[PDB]
Design a protein around this ligand. Structure first.
Ligand code: C1H
Ligand code: HG
Ligand code: ZN
Length: 256
């Protein structure tokens, strides 16, 4: 099945998932000089105060931190969004070196990592219904560069021994994602897709401009993670990112 190597990487995905060459695929490069300020954009609202993390899972691609979304607790509203989007999970893509890792790039600049917090539109009742919908998902993208440590990321980092290999999960309750926001909510927004198969074209992207900085020692632990399952050849989980995909004259709008 799909992965990030020579034989199962992003260049092979189109075979099982034709939509991989669709009209609103992700990620894209954000050309800061072509993006336009959008006055019709509402203020963005990220309410993560009542968020309830359940568990952390190595899925053979990333780790997902998973949330109980049976209630209307952690939510994205505002911005390009209409109505309410519920937080279901978060995860990252990172590099083998600090000069690669992000999925979205800024004027072709690659950051060491990118965080995606994934939300479903509550008019659709479940997540599964939402992904049959053009406005089904909202993902909130955040860049990571290597500098001073992010204290709010340290609980994720320390638990990663728990979930070394494909399959493993760890109980992961009371994690606060608020610890992972940068101070500014300035952002670019376009309609796009999941960046992993099935690459469903269901996402309003809200990519934050200000990146968070994490330590060299922090990103280093992500890199110790395994692609393989327990007792298999060691493939370090590095470079689990998709490259920028053709814009196809969508317009990227700026909140600033
Ligand atoms: N990087 S990204 O653009 O944000 C994503 N790339 N992939 C993402 N997946 S997910 O939205 O988060 C997610 C969430 C909760 C449960 C599940 C889940 O366990 O169900 C499988 C989802 C359909 C794929 O399988 N399939 O047979 O079609 C998945 S999000
Ligand atoms: Hg869709
Ligand atoms: Zn992602």
């Amino acid at each position: 099945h799909w992965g990030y190597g020579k034989h199962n990487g992003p260049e092979h995905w189109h075979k099982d998932f034709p939509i991989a060459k669709g009209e609103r695929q992700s990620p894209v490069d954000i050309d800061t000089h072509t993006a336009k300020y959008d006055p019709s954009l509402k203020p963005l609202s990220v309410s993560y105060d009542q968020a309830t993390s359940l568990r952390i899972l190595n899925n053979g691609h990333a780790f997902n931190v998973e949330f109980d979304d049976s209630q209307d607790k952690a939510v994205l509203k505002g911005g390009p969004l209409d109505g309410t989007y519920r937080l279901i999970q978060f995860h990252f893509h990172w590099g083998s070196l600090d000069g690669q890792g992000s999925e979205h790039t800024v004027d072709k600049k690659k950051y060491a990592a990118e965080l995606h917090l994934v939300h479903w539109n509550t008019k659709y009742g479940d997540f599964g219904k939402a992904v049959q919908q053009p406005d089904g998902l909202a993902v909130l993208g955040i860049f990571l560069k290597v500098g001073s440590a992010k204290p709010g990321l340290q609980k994720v980092v320390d638990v990663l021994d728990s979930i070394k290999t494909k399959g493993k999960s760890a109980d992961f309750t009371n994690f606060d994602p608020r610890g992972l926001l940068p101070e500014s909510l300035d952002y670019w927004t376009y309609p796009g897709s999941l960046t992993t198969p099935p690459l469903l074209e269901c996402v309003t992207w809200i990519v934050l401009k200000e990146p968070i900085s994490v330590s060299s020692e922090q990103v280093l632990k992500f890199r110790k993670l395994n692609f393989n399952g327990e007792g298999e050849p060691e493939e370090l989980m590095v470079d689990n990112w998709r490259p920028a995909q053709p814009l196809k004259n969508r317009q990227i709008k700026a909140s600033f």
